[PDB]
Amino acid sequence: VKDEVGIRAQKLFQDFLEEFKEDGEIKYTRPAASLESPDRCTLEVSFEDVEKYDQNLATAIIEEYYHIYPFLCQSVSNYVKDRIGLKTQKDCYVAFTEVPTRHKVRDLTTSKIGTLIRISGQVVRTHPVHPELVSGVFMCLDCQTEIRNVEQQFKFTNPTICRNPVCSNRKRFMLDVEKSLFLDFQKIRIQETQAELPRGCIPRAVEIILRSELVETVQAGDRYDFTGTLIVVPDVSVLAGVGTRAENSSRHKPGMRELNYRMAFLACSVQATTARFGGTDLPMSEVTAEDMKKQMTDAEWHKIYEMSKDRNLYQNLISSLFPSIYGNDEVKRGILLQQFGGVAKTTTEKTSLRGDINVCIVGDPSTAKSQFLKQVSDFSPRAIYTSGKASSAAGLTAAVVRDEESFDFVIEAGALMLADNGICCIDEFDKMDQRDQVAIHEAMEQQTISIARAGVRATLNARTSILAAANPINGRYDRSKSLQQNIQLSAPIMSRFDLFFILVDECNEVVDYAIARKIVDLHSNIEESVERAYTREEVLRYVTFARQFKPVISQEAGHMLVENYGHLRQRDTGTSGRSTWRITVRQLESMIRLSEAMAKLECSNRVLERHVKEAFRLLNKSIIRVEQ
Amino acid sequence: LGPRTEIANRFQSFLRTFVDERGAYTYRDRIRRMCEQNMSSFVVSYTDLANKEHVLAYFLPEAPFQMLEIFDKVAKDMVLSIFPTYERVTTEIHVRISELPLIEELRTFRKLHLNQLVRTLGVVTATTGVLPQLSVIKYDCVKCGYVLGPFVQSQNTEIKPGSCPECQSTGPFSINMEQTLYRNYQKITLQESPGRIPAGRIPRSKDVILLADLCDQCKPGDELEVTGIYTNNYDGSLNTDQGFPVFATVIIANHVVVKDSKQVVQSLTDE
DNA sequence: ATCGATCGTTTTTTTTTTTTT
DNA sequence: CGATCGAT
Ligand SMILES: Nc1ncnc2c1ncn2[C@@H]1O[C@H](COP(=O)(O)OP(=O)(O)O)[C@@H](O)[C@H]1O
Fold first, then answer.
1. Do the Cβ atoms of B114 and A180 come closer than 8 Å?
2. A564: annotated binding-site residue?
3. Ligand 1 mean position to A364 CA, how many Å?
4. Which residues of B fall within a CB distance of 8 Å from A236?
5. How far apart, in Å, do the first and last CA atoms of chain A sit?
6. Secondary structure class of B225 (helix, strand, coil)
7. What is d(CA B215, CA B184) in angstroms, rounded to the nearest whole number?
8. How would DSSP label each residue in A370-432?
9. Which residues of B247-256 are buried (b: 16+ CB within 10 A; e: fewer)?
């Protein structure tokens, strides 16, 4: 038999890593040790390590793989047997990696089979889980049916001759779906590499298949690294293949099937890169291996305590993410509270209670209100941005279909709608048509929305806050008309938005030259930016930690937010004579979570009356800022 | 057997022994209340089942089929024995469960879930109308002109014995359109809700079977909770194959629950 | 067991009307 | 074109 060399090879590979494999340690025993209890049968193996210990079985491997492949499972079983009292339930999935060579859709021939190569592309027109009972039990009819044999080939054949008797050799027993061998896969398609975009021909597409553990972790918009298991495809029928046809015409002494095979492709490894984030128990670049609530959730307390303790870190952090930017210092402190948590109570079945807050920008032209947010897509997770007219109202809705593809009417998603716990802000809120506008009129507040005309019990939900992009009528803040005529917009959204912070433009020479003095350290290609206080890694980790705390109110300003709000509406008892304005409890709700988040800054629970006072100050800022 | 007799005995010494509601147990009398309204859809508590004897949680999944059968047999042998008055109208029974500490969303169930205890929900979509199938195997001999007789039926399998009044002969035959037992039917097509999707792509779906007792309750776009169990058509055409078996999956309903349920609904506390 | 004579065997289409946003 | 079925 051919591959007994491969048998002994991975055998003594085990026998070496049965001892140490890496510095008195092994990287593929503790994965197997976690395996031992549930026995899930997936273990990736480093391809480098074949060249480390086995001394270039890569070329012993990377051609006759498809035939050798099954012997690796027997090898796997032999591994698990040595130290575990073992039954042959064991199996072999593999998710190979540590492989160098990266080829594409063009170097395809008869000579490319049985390899392990890594390849990318795109993901399109996905398709579902569709099981397989590959195996069973089948022989003659009478008694002699105990058949756990090798009958699991792709080309399936109930017909078997016999095991013990002289009995039927076409009349089969019945089937076993009970105590036999089954498994799963799916099927999707892939387009040409967007890293390899030549002219002329189409995006030649490949067929693709996935084993058990690979499943439902592919997804549209993602590039990959496969195995190189190009196939002889056990196909059944096709046209246009009018080549010569053959079949075994046996010995003369004193069934048919037309043969035209097609191609597909199979793979048993994935690194869905460019699509990987990780929360806080992932060890980052900067860590501190310590004990904590969880693994690395705040094990950098050794610093994050410090980043939660200073009375200076407020302003320092206000200045630790605008190094390349200069403007007012109010949104530079308020906008983070949009990204910073809210309330997060633990309370009744009254109704959904919200954590997030509406947020706005207005300003004169060319003020880099865009550059505030152009980065934010690159900044936060879940929170990817484009414009609203960057798509249709198949941004909010999906693309409305009136032709038959699966059931002839499909509006079940959107573009705003898939921003769950991230914001997908938009620009140009003034000239956009009043369709998504009145959709947002309740989709921001009552985050539980429906449609008709194509509804599969339409109940969708927004999840996050927003960033606005207004601009005045004349392009300038010419004080010649009221704000209600300066923007020519509605009331309730001007109250739904509990925070405005308009950016006004002027002309004073020192300012503009000071900006160019920013530019002094924008192209000094060494030192083209300004100093900082806090690195990004610790910043986002502190952010990722500061939520898990259960913020609380028991504070006399919590008792006497009645007092500050009574004064809020005492001074706002007017705002009715000269160009009347409106007060409303959304303002209170917003101040509440605002004060709460302002104390969530503290890495502490339990609201303090300082936070109320600053929140009152800021609300006063916003409302007097609304003053004409 | 000695032990394999004790299943029904456990049911019998359950339904009139495990008692709550401050005495005078439900299944002492709830079965009576089922016979009263002429329902034949008694439903069982898994909570209360475990509160009596935990043993039948592991003795289920090896064949919940036979568990359910060996239960409803007990319901008959109790009912017609104490209510022989019953023995005209329907005289056939099956039972239900409504306590499974689990919701499997769709896109969650795989080859491990084969032919065993299940729960899941979804949304209804368009499906068939109202039809029956058969329930018993009987044909008619024509060599001797006799009846082949009634024959024991397997779920989707042939019998064909030689034994019959025609000198156990007459391989050929014909079949009648009467003297044989029937069974209503209806289907469903289950989709997943627009709330609990993976947030923006096409959804998944599998089909579900309801049976003669179970029809004319559902509708397109209705609220639901079902135990069901995982099916397998055992061959969607195995042969020299695709790059893939053309297999499929269904769920067969044991106990369906509506989650709207806009009728007069609740049981009675004793006080 | 072997050969031969018995039995039974079938598949092909593209486009127009009213409806909904 | 395939399997059944009978005898030699
Ligand atoms: N403080 C600042 N920091 C960095 N860039 C600035 C600053 N102020 C103005 N700019 C520049 O001014 C430009 C503003 O244009 P922008 O406001 O995006 O146009 P629009 O007014 O159409 O939104 C940006 O390209 C930005 O680089």
1. no
2. no
3. 10
4. 239-242
5. 91
6. strand
7. 8
8. SHHHHTHHHHSSS-----STTS-TTTTS-----S-SSSS------SSTT-TTS----S--SSS
9. bebbbbbbbb
- Residue B102 is encoded by which pair of tokens? 């689990």
Per DSSP, the three-state class of B206 is strand
C1' of D1 to CA of A256 (Å): 11
Residues shown for chain B = 271
Nearest atom, ligand 1, residue A327 CA = 1
φ/ψ of B100, rounded to 5, equals -140, 115
A369 assigned binding-site residue: yes
Token pair belonging to A522:
């924008």
Instruction: State if residue A371 touches ligand 1 by the CB under 6 angstroms criterion.
Output: yes
8 Å CB contact of A177 and B234: yes
Q: Are A132 and B242 inside 8 Å of each other by CB?
A: no
Angle at alpha carbon of residue A279, lines to A277 and A282, rounded to 5° = 90
- Chain-centroid distance of CA B105 in Å reads 21
Integer Cα distance of A485 and A473 in angstroms: 9
Q: Which two tokens stand for residue B68?
A: 């359910």
d(CA A115, CA A59): 9
Using a 6 Å cutoff on CB, does residue A374 contact ligand 1?
no
Q: Which technique was used to obtain these atomic coordinates?
A: cryo-EM
* Residue A206: how many other CB atoms lie within 10 Å: 19
- What is the rounded distance in angstroms from the CA atom of residue A3 to the CA atom of residue A114? 14
Going through chain B in order, the beta strands assigned E by DSSP cover: 43-44, 96-97, 123-125, 131-134, 137-139, 149-151, 182-191, 205-211, 225-226, 229-230, 250-252, 256-257
Task: Give kind and range of the element (H or E) at residue A624.
Answer: helix A609-625
Chain-centre distance for alpha carbon A609? 39
Find the residue in B nearest to A220 (Cα). B201
d(CA A613, CA A17) in angstroms, rounded, equals: 64
For B233, nearest residue in chain A (alpha carbons): A177
Q: Which pair of structure tokens corresponds to residue B76?
A: 């008959």
Tokens of residue A581, six digits: 């304005």
- Cβ contacts of B114 on chain A, cutoff 8 Å: 177, 182
Mutate to test the interface with B, among A93, A126, A133, A157 (most CBs of B within 10 A): A133
Residue whose C-alpha is closest to residue A487's, from A446, A438, A435, A430: A430
What tokens appear for A95 in the block? 């998710």
In angstroms, the CA of A498 and the C1' of C14 are apart by 60
214-273 of chain A touching strand D, CB 7 A cut-off: 255-256
Measured CA to CA in angstroms, residue B68 lies from A216, A565, B254 at distances of 34, 65, 9
CB A121 within 8 A of CB A130: no
Could you give the angle at the alpha carbon of A619 between the alpha carbons of A613 and A621, nearest 5°? 105
Resolution for this PDB entry, in angstroms: 4.0
Name the B residues in 112-141 with CB < 8 Å from any A CB.
Answer: 114-115, 123, 125
Task: Tell me the C-alpha to C-alpha distance, in Å, between residue A609 and each of A549, A563, A566, A599, A618.
Answer: 19, 12, 15, 10, 14
Beta-ladder partners of B205: B191
Give the mutation candidate from B190, B219, B230, B241 for the A interface (greatest A CB count, under 10 A). B241
